[PDB]
Amino acid sequence: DKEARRKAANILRDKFLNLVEQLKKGEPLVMEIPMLRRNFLDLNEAKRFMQTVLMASIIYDALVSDEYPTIRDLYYRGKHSLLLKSIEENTWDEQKESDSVIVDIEVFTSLLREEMLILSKEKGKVVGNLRIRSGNDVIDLSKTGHGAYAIEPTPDLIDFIDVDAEFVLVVEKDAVFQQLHRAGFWKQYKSILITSAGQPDRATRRFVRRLNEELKLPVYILTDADPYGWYIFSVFRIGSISERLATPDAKFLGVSMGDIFGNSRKKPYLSEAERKNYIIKAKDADIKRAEEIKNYEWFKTKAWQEEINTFLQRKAKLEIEAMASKGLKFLAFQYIPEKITNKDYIA
């Protein structure tokens, strides 16, 4: 009784079968990889081929055969035949290898794993004034007890209906999420509140840039002082460790250096006292990472720079908990609202 689902399971095959098919037995063909052709008639390249045109069919077959393949489930088709040649080697040897072959196909076609149905392994809750149909149900995201809905690793077959908010807020620590949630932030200041859980997964992403893109909702996110926190953010405006389906122009909301120290222009949020003991001093293995990023072509651009070296300079960071340990009331009806309306953040 499957629907918008048996949509893709079709646009998949036909708009694929055709592209990988080349046969054309007039003259010797090759694939084109735009990011570099791969001639089957090479040496260094010979093996790289049989690997693509395999891990591919494995997909296309498991595709019409109504299966739901996980990436590893697919790695485990290394060695597919009995031995024809008695060399008196393996198809692929290490998952890493198999994966790359994916990503290559993934380009040749234009279709991202999740669209070919290879369903992977996703986490990341969400909650808010939002109503979707997923598969055969419509589940309302307000009415959720203290729990929370957790997206489906295929978040592209998921229809929006009624919405009610002005901004999406992406928080990184599951523990704090449970806090913002059991006060009621997302209802008081109409919003949708979603957490990743640390490193953002491959499709807690897609959800986000879909909110931001199809519903015109602005996205603020928040984590720790450290270079760690700057990273989370990085991923959210591109996709883990250098397609174009992750959201740029997301917004960084604190915790800011000046958040803890101030400017001659603007008051600090931390008491001089609390600060001496909440601040965890900077190990030098940290100051490395900073100086590596301070260089990334999408930090270099802004006066995002400003808030980097200020750190390179005060050698100091704090955990988000610390701040919230001031007590939800503050974190709820002061920090966010103040900062947000205040235009205190980076863009």
Partner: protein
């Protein structure tokens, strides 16, 4: 005369080195008594130790060659030859004293005779001798002369000479003679029996004996005062100068000659026996200058062979490849010369950091002084990378032969060749014309290994993309095995784009 106080110069410096000499003097000769008259030679070489206290040995050579006309026995061993009467056909053998020196050294330190035997071709009996010499007035004294009966079809020449030397000091160096002579002369059968009791037998590996060398008329550009005189006082009739300038030298036709008489400025119809000391010279000048003669004909020369070489150094090194080359003949100071060259590679040849160089002048090995040789230069000078060689250590061997009637030797009889430029260049190229045969074979080795490298890998890869690409066609589980094969072999053939082979490996 001279060899009496200045020994070392003709090659008898000390006891030991003399042994080696006498040995390579007897072989040298015994061959030129067979292979030049067209018989498969069977030389036997035995050295014996007959007295321990004084260190006396007995070199002995026995052939199946022609032999000496009996009466000329004394005038071959006893008589001391002043000079090396200008040469007119290729021979083995340096100086102009040769085998004579051996007998002379023998009467200086020991008191035993020189046992000799000969029996000419188609001979009645075997004439035996046993000779000693009178050194003061140059004339040989016969101690014994007799003859017995010949057991049919026999002809040969047995020479037995006793000298003092040092076997152990020159052992390892003599063995190199035999060995190395064997190589370039495989139409022979050698046996060697050392004073200890060690026998060695190297067997005839074929019988394609090369063409022998032909005697030929002297060539103008390479003769002077001394000779002209002896060509004249060696005549029989009254030649005029004309005849004499024509029927006596290479290169001198009617019109070709007349102009020489215009130069030296001589009457043409003048008696020959009537030539003053100065008139002659005024001729030998214009000889030296005249521009266009022809080439000193090389019918007086003799070659190994672009094959006896191959075989020779194949049947003893057993390599993975061999090649040789015989050049066209060039010309030097009124005489002709040719350079032969060869190389062997891999297989059994010992792995070492540098190549082995065998030198050859006039069908005889040169052992001593390899370091001061015009050859040892070129083949160390040569850049072995511009010819294949990748590795640090490798197994290569190199054979360079040089022959003429006028071999330029560098120093006072010291067993190595002189740096005559025009020669050195034909020696080079010759090596290049082999060396670039080496690059070829080692270019078809990477080729032959490149096929079995691909064509092997593909046999593994064309079934897989075959199946895979077939599943894409018919989705239904029936064509799986039909579409399969009708493009497996379809694929397979698209491969004989590059290389053609049908191969079954099980």
């Amino acid at each position: 005369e001279f060899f009496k106080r200045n020994p070392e110069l003709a090659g008898f410096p000390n006891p030991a080195r003399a042994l080696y000499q006498t040995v390579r003097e007897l072989i040298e000769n015994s061959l030129d008594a067979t292979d030049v008259h067209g018989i498969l030679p069977n030389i036997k070489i035995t050295i014996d130790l007959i007295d321990d206290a004084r260190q006396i040995y007995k070199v002995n050579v026995v052939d199946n060659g022609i032999g000496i006309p009996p009466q000329e026995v004394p005038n071959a061993f006893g008589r001391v030859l002043y000079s090396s009467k200008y040469v007119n056909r290729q021979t083995r053998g340096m100086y102009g004293l040769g085998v004579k020196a051996a007998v002379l050294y023998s009467q200086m330190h020991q008191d035993k005779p020189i046992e000799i035997e000969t029996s000419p071709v188609n001979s009645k009996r075997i004439y035996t001798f046993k000779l000693k010499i009178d050194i003061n007035k140059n004339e040989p004294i016969i101690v014994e002369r007799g003859s017995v009966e010949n057991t049919r079809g026999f002809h040969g020449t047995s020479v037995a000479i006793s000298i003092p030397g040092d076997w152990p000091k020159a052992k390892s160096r003599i063995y190199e003679y035999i060995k190395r002579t064997y190589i370039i002369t495989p139409y022979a059968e050698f046996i060697f029996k050392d004073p200890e009791g060690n026998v060695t037998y190297y067997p005839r590996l074929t019988n394609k004996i090369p063409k022998p060398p032909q005697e030929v008329k002297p060539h103008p550009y390479g003769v002077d005062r001394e000779e002209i005189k002896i060509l004249i006082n060696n005549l029989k009739r009254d030649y005029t100068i004309k005849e004499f300038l024509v029927n006596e030298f290479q290169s001198i036709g009617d019109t070709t000659a007349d102009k020489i008489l215009e130069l030296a400025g001589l009457k043409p119809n003048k008696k020959v026996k009537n030539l003053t000391e100065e008139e002659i010279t005024r001729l030998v000048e214009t000889f030296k200058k005249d521009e266009d003669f022809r080439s000193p004909s090389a019918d007086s020369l003799s070659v190994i062979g672009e094959d006896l070489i191959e075989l020779g150094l194949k049947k003893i090194f057993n390599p993975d490849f061999a090649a040789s080359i015989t050049r066209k003949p060039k010309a030097y100071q009124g005489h002709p010369f040719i350079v032969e060259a060869g190389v062997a590679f891999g297989g059994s040849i010992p792995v070492g950091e540098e190549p082995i160089v065998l030198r050859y002048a006039n069908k005889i090995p040169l052992i001593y002084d390899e370091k001061s040789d015009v050859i040892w230069k070129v083949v160390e000078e040569l850049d072995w990378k511009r010819y294949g060689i990748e590795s640090d250590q490798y197994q290569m061997v190199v054979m360079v032969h040089l022959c003429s009637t006028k071999i330029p030797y560098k120093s006072a009889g010291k067993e190595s060749i002189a740096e005559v430029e025009n020669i050195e260049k034909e020696i080079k190229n010759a090596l290049m014309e082999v060396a670039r045969k080496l690059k070829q074979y080692l270019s078809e080795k990477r080729k032959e290994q490149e096929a079995k490298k691909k064509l092997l890998a593909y046999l593994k890869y064309i079934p897989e993309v075959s199946r895979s690409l077939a599943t894409f066609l018919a989705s239904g589980n029936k064509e799986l095995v039909s579409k399969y094969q009708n493009e497996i072999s379809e694929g397979l053939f698209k491969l004989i784009s590059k290389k053609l082979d049908l191969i079954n490996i099980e």
